[PDB]
Amino acid sequence: MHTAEFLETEPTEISSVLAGGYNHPLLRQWQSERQLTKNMLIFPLFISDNPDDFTEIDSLPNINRIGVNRLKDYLKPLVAKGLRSVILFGVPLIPGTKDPVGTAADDPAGPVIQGIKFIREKFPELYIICDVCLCEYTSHGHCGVLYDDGTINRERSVSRLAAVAVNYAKAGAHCVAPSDMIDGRIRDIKRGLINANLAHKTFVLSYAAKFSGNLYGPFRDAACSAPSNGDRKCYQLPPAGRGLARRALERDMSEGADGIIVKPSTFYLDIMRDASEICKDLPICAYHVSGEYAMLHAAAEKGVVDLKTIAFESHTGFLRAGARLIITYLAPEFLDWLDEE
Amino acid sequence: DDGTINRERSVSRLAAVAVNYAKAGAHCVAPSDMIDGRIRDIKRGLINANLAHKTFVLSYAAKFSGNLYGPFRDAACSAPSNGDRKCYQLPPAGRGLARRALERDMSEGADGIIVKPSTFYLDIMRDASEICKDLPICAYHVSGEYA
Amino acid sequence: MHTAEFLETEPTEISSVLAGGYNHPLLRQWQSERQLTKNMLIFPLFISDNPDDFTEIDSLPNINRIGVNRLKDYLKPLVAKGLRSVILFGVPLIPGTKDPVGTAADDPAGPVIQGIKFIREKFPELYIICDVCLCEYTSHGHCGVLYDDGTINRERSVSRLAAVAVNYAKAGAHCVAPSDMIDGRIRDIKRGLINANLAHKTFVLSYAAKFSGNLYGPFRDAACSAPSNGDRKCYQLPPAGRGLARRALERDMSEGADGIIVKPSTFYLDIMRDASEICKDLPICAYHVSGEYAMLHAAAEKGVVDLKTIAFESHTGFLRAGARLIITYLAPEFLDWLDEE
Amino acid sequence: MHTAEFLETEPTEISSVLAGGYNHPLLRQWQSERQLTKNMLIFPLFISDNPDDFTEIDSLPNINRIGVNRLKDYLKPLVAKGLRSVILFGVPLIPGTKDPVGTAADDPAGPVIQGIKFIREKFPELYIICDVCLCEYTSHGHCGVLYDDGTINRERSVSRLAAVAVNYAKAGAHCVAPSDMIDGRIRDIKRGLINANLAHKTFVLSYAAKFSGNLYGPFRDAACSAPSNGDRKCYQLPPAGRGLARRALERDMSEGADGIIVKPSTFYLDIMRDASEICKDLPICAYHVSGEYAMLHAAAEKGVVDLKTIAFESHTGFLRAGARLIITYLAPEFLDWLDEE
Ligand SMILES: [Zn+2]
Ligand SMILES: [Zn+2]
Ligand SMILES: [Zn+2]
């Protein structure tokens, strides 16, 4: 009958033996090129036009649209648990606010500058990062200023973004993160910071490799950011575009970026690996996007995977791919889990 | 008896299974056991059976432990008894081990490599792309990434 | 007597065994770094001065000189079979047309702009590429504007080519491909596109490494391009010039090329390999030249090789050497063969 | 009306100027990484079973099937013009000669050993290379010894080839060139040479990267080599297989090859480039195959290109891709042309 066959074997070659290095829990930690800490997390905030808001973003699980009068109460516990940095997103809901040139982007009375001022006052230890773009302030919803045909107007756009970025810094933001993907904007923003004598104190965190895609769905709802006048495929990198992303990282670093962001994250981990060699001397940051975030929550509610587990796996994945920073909506969770782990 | 894996007896067995499949008509063999040195034994076994010139050896060179194999366990009634599989499956943060496992497997005879999981390990595919630049790389879109 | 001798042998080393990887038809496909698809093909068109033309180019097998009124009928079936792009070559036969400065190069009523306009109208999905050069429009037949001695005048030439290129784009061409080989023309053309606000929508496909040679014979007949006033060895790269070709690829990429062309192709496959590392982040295109093309047809008619076979071998050769695009006169053939293969 | 437009231009950047390096005939020679000399040529000889033969190989232009009594007359003028080396191919036509094990491969009375002996005697300065394979001596026509299923039997094949190779060397051949493509044969042949105390005086020239293809047509006629029992795609490299060819060059060098051959040549120039880096320390040789050779003759007779011209272009192409040796049927021609050039 059928019996278990066992082939004759030669002695074990030492080169085949990797096992001695990961047979214990501690060894699996010794094995990571980088360990996850609380200071590597950056939590995004969607600041509202209505100071009393604390609105539910149905498509973005456990994330709200917070007004300034509701900020101290929200941030107090996070900061008490170790939060070190936040990234501001403005959501001006007052009518009449939006226009073709994103005028309200740097409005001193707008949510962003208002949130910056509030934070520097009630939380002077928090590191403030401000996303820099016009999508949330333009009536057309696109990332920059358009020509009449509907296409983006590079020089006028970068000219505008540069101003917004300097204005945020002038207001007190420690860092500026342009996520517009428009050619040459980093150079203009850096030059603008230098002319304002703010470049020696403003970190420029560029979204150097930001891809077009099906993963920004819930963020559009939270920032009321959806475009009008098509897709964003002309400035956002195509998903298969690895050469463009590689040339965009070299460009941005050359133009002054002090750090880079890869976005999305899980779906673009190989891109983080590339940036790790090209921008080896700068901090790399992974952005765990709204759609990657809600995809983890759905699969988890479906029983497919376990939230905490897959969150740790995915997040250590960023650090493995080369990132040392992470912008993620799971920050409140991690600020808790890291106490234990 | 302790519950740990027995390398030599395991690779000895896997080598036999692999040759037997090939003997039956399979064009390719893909070992997904993650046990040290199995590729060499399987390649040697194929050579001794005069089947190495016609059998592609597709190794799961970089196969990580994780929370993404849930549905596959149900489909193959594969769930272990006697703990986790973390001693042979690569830890998720283990990029050096995965890099040394790709070099090992290629050196031991792999004609192609598999990275598994896939989406959650795309940077690993990038590494394999340079280390195993001359062989076909395959991504495995796992049951849990799929569901 | 003489008997078959067989030397004593040691067991087989695993490192000697490559065979397990290509013993089946599918495996031979798994083995290619890149597979050939219909969208990688670019078909050249020689547009005539006479809208009713459909003239036979005796030295270029199965290729004609087509006028605008004969274009819809020619292109309809190709496009129905998958054609995605074309490269336009103008052949103005009206007398008086040619002059020392290639004036008619950008003539709005000339074949090129007329063909561009017709195509954008009857075939809005087709990607239009226009070769950019003065050889087909100069009375002397050379690639640029000459000094009195007969040598090329760099600044005046690049100055002219830049204008032609922007004019084509202004007319609707999506891409410009300069094949003049004159020092610094890419920079001038890119700057010209930027000044015209067309650089964000115009792909610049440079013939970065274009060699002098015995393989352009049939193309001279099809475009009535033969020079007057010697050889083209001063701007075309010498065949043995690998360092120059390597420095020309770095130059062109630095000056703005979005993609590069290697030309010729089969006879310069090692050059495609070099470009693959130097211009690793940009699309590389092989140009299967008129003479390589008719050489395959002759050898085939001689029984030396089989057309379809050698065409597949040669074309996958480009993809092996690193190209991801191919400009070739066998496009109609391949658009058929790829259905099967 | 339409006037020649000339765009405004900025001063010339020195980095755009390559022209100063190739504006004179001599400079085009200074530009080659390697110049072509008579000692780089290797001329193939098809030795016949009939010592009085001087037979015309209809598919291979100007190449014959020469018997030993017709050798001194053929080789005298070539050698007087500079020929330094030849590669022997045996074509035993006597019936009964062929068998399943290629027994006659090393027959002391066969054409090869007979030609080796004749050459070492009447031409002691000539360098003798002998192709090593069983295709021309097996009744099935394949490159090695088969199992019953029709597939190749690696160990028995390499075992046989090793013997043939040592036997040729024992007879006086200075070099052995295995073109069988069977896994691990180089190691067995090198070991066999070492055991015979002939490794310190026998150059092992391996056909390390030999591709399957549509270019060996005329050679099959000249060596009466066509297989029986299908294609040779299991051991010959697939055309798209660049990784396999790269691993085959590393293997062969590791197993003892003193030099490598790339075959075919023009159609595989990128492969020569790869070998140039991998086998940077060994002589690389290009084999201008029978089909590439007759393709040049047909295109030339068709007026497509000029023989002499395209021959120089193609041959300097090998040297550009990295080769320093060339096996070619145009050797008689080049031995003449090089006097002038
Ligand atoms: Zn935006
Ligand atoms: Zn021209
Ligand atoms: Zn053979």
DSSP states of D1-59 as a string?
---------PPPPGGG--GGGSSSHHHHHHT-SS---GGGEEEEEEEESSTT-EEE-TT
* D175 annotated ligand-binding residue: no
| Pairing between β-strand D284-288 and β-strand D259-263 as defined by DSSP bridges | parallel
Q: Is C235 helix (H, G, I), strand (E, B) or coil?
A: coil
Q: Is A97 helix (H, G, I), strand (E, B) or coil?
A: coil
- Single out the catalytic residue among D76, D117, D263, D308: D263
Q: Kindly give the distance from the C-alpha atom of residue B101 to the centroid of ligand 1, in angstroms, as a whole number.
A: 42
Chains B and C touch (3+ CB pairs under 8 A): yes
CA distance B128 to B63: 12
CA distances for A169 relative to A174, A180, A198, A255, A257, angstroms: 6, 18, 7, 18, 15
For residues B128 and B115, the answer to whether their CB atoms sit within 8 Å is yes
Reference A22, options B34, B87, B103, B35; nearest CA is B87
Residues of C taking part in catalysis = 210, 263
Beta-bridge partner residues of C237 = C211
The structure tokens listed for C244 are 């120059």
Q: Which residues of B touch A33 (CB under 8 A)?
A: 93, 95-96
Structural method: X-ray
For residues D130 and D116, the answer to whether their CB atoms sit within 8 Å is yes
CA distance D285 to D262: 6
Mutate to test the interface with A, among C281, C282, C325 (most CBs of A within 10 A): C281
Sign of CA dihedral C157, C159, C162, C164: negative
Chains A and C touch (3+ CB pairs under 8 A): yes
- Nearest C-alpha in B relative to A306: B67
D226 to chain B, closest Cα gap in Å = 23
Q: Which residues of C touch D308 (CB under 8 A)?
A: none
The structure tokens listed for B103 are 């070099």
Ligand nearest to the CA of C232: 2
Ligand nearest to the CA of C220: 2
CA distance B4 to A282: 43
Q: What is the dihedral of CA C28, C29, C31, C36, to 10 degrees?
A: 130
For residues A304 and B70, the answer to whether their CB atoms sit within 8 Å is yes
Task: Note the Cα C169 to chain centre separation in Å.
Answer: 19
DSSP secondary structure code for residue D183 in this structure: T
The structure tokens listed for D247 are 């691993």
DSSP secondary structure code for residue B64 in this structure: B
Rg value, chain B, Cα: 15
DSSP secondary structure code for residue A68 in this structure: G
CA distance D224 to D203: 27
Reference B112, options A179, C183, C30; nearest CA is C30
Cβ <8 Å between A6 and B16: yes
* A220 annotated ligand-binding residue: yes
Q: Which residues of B touch D151 (CB under 8 A)?
A: 53-54
Give residues preceding each break in chain A, C–N over 2.5 A. Answer: none
In order, the DSSP letters of D190-232 are HHHHHHTT-TTT-EEEEEEEEB-SSS-HHHHHHHT---SSS-S
CA distance A19 to A30: 14
Phi and psi of D61, rounded to 5°? Answer: -45, 125
CA distance C237 to C251: 14
CA distance D181 to D184: 9
Nearest beta carbon to residue D238 from set C22, C163, C192: C22
Angle, CA of A176, A180 and A186, to the nearest 5°: 55
CA distance C253 to C278: 9
Chains A and D touch (3+ CB pairs under 8 A): no
**Which letter, b or e, does each residue of A250-270 get, where b requires 16 or more Cβ atoms within 10 Å of its Cβ?**
ebbbebbbbbbbbbbbbbbbb
Q: Which residues of B touch A267 (CB under 8 A)?
A: 119, 122
Nearest beta carbon to residue A246 from set C200, C281, C283: C281
Reply yes or no: is the peptide bond before residue D25 cis, omega within 30 of 0.
Answer: no
Cβ <8 Å between C200 and A147: no
Reference C193, options C172, C151, C163, C228; nearest CA is C163
- Nearest C-alpha in B relative to D243: B134
Ligand nearest to the CA of A235: 1
For residues A31 and A192, the answer to whether their CB atoms sit within 8 Å is no
Cβ <8 Å between D267 and C268: no
DSSP secondary structure code for residue A238 in this structure: P
**Which letter, b or e, does each residue of A95-116 get, where b requires 16 or more Cβ atoms within 10 Å of its Cβ?**
eeebeebbbbbbbeebbbbbbb
Cβ partners under 8 Å of residue A13, min gap 6: B37, B40
- Single out the catalytic residue among D210, D233, D302, D308: D210
| Pairing between β-strand D325-328 and β-strand D284-288 as defined by DSSP bridges | parallel
Secondary structure of chain D: what % helix, strand, coil (to 5)?
40, 15, 40
B38 to chain C, closest Cα gap in Å = 13
Q: Amino acid identity, residue D271?
A: I
Give residues preceding each break in chain D, C–N over 2.5 A. Answer: none
CA distance A61 to A53: 17
For residues C310 and C296, the answer to whether their CB atoms sit within 8 Å is yes
For residues C74 and C119, the answer to whether their CB atoms sit within 8 Å is no
Task: Note the Cα A294 to chain centre separation in Å.
Answer: 15
Q: Which residues of B touch A274 (CB under 8 A)?
A: 126
CA distances for D299 relative to A104, C115, D295, D326, angstroms: 70, 33, 6, 22
Measured in angstroms, the resolution is 2.2
Q: Please name the residue that has the structure tokens 């092989």.
A: C286
Cβ partners under 8 Å of residue C153, min gap 6: C144, C145, C146, C147
Ligand nearest to the CA of C216: 2
Q: Is A88 helix (H, G, I), strand (E, B) or coil?
A: strand
CA distance D4 to C139: 14
Beta-bridge partner residues of A285 = A261, A325
For residues C191 and C145, the answer to whether their CB atoms sit within 8 Å is no
CA distances for A316 relative to A331, C56, C70, C283, angstroms: 14, 65, 61, 34
Give residues preceding each break in chain C, C–N over 2.5 A. Answer: none
Using beta carbons and an 8 Å cutoff, which residues of B are at the interface with C?
A: 27, 40, 43-44, 46-47, 52-57, 107-109, 111-112, 135-136
CA distance A129 to A69: 20
Cβ partners under 8 Å of residue B139, min gap 6: B114, B115, B116, B118, B125
* A135 annotated ligand-binding residue: yes
Long-range contacts of D68-76 (CB under 8 A, 24+ apart): D68/D111, D68/D114, D68/D115, D68/D118, D71/D45, D71/D47, D71/D115, D71/D118, D71/D119, D71/D122, D72/D118, D72/D122, D75/D119, D75/D122, D75/D123, D75/D126
B145 to chain A, closest Cα gap in Å = 9
B132 to chain D, closest Cα gap in Å = 9
The structure tokens listed for A296 are 């983890």
User: What separation, in Å, do the N-terminal and C-terminal C-alpha atoms of chain D show?
Assistant: 52
For residues A256 and A295, the answer to whether their CB atoms sit within 8 Å is no
Q: Which domains does chain A have, with CATH numbers?
A: 1-341 (3.20.20.70)
Q: How many residues does chain D have?
A: 341
Beta-bridge partner residues of D178 = D132
Under 8 Å CB pairs connecting chains B and D tally to 16
CA distance C116 to C252: 25
A141 to chain B, closest Cα gap in Å = 30
| Other Cβ atoms closer than 10 A to D10 | 10
Q: Amino acid identity, residue D283?
A: P
The structure tokens listed for D300 are 């030339």
For residues C180 and C237, the answer to whether their CB atoms sit within 8 Å is no
User: What separation, in Å, do the N-terminal and C-terminal C-alpha atoms of chain C show?
Assistant: 52
A193 to chain C, closest Cα gap in Å = 25
Cβ <8 Å between A21 and B97: yes
CA distance C264 to C217: 12
Cβ partners under 8 Å of residue C170, min gap 6: C196, C198
For residues B67 and A309, the answer to whether their CB atoms sit within 8 Å is yes
Using beta carbons and an 8 Å cutoff, which residues of B are at the interface with D?
A: 50, 53-54, 133-136
CA distance A183 to A236: 11
CA distance D111 to D33: 39
| Pairing between β-strand C41-48 and β-strand C54-56 as defined by DSSP bridges | unpaired
Beta-bridge partner residues of A20 = none
Q: How many residues does chain B have?
A: 147
The structure tokens listed for A42 are 């950056």
DSSP secondary structure code for residue A261 in this structure: E
CA distance A310 to A334: 12
Please report how many Cα atoms fall inside a 13 Å half-sphere around the Cα of residue B72, on the Cβ side.
14
The structure tokens listed for D221 are 């006629």
CA distance C5 to A302: 69
User: What separation, in Å, do the N-terminal and C-terminal C-alpha atoms of chain A show?
Assistant: 52
CA distance D203 to C31: 32
Q: Kindly give the distance from the C-alpha atom of residue D226 to the centroid of ligand 3, in angstroms, as a whole number.
A: 9
Cβ <8 Å between B56 and C17: no
Q: Kindly give the distance from the C-alpha atom of residue B100 to the centroid of ligand 3, in angstroms, as a whole number.
A: 38
Cβ <8 Å between A152 and C200: yes
> Would you call D210 a catalytic residue per the annotation?
yes
Beta-bridge partner residues of A146 = A152
Ligand nearest to the CA of C137: 2
| Pairing between β-strand C64-66 and β-strand D203-210 as defined by DSSP bridges | unpaired
Mutate to test the interface with D, among C28, C237, C304 (most CBs of D within 10 A): C304
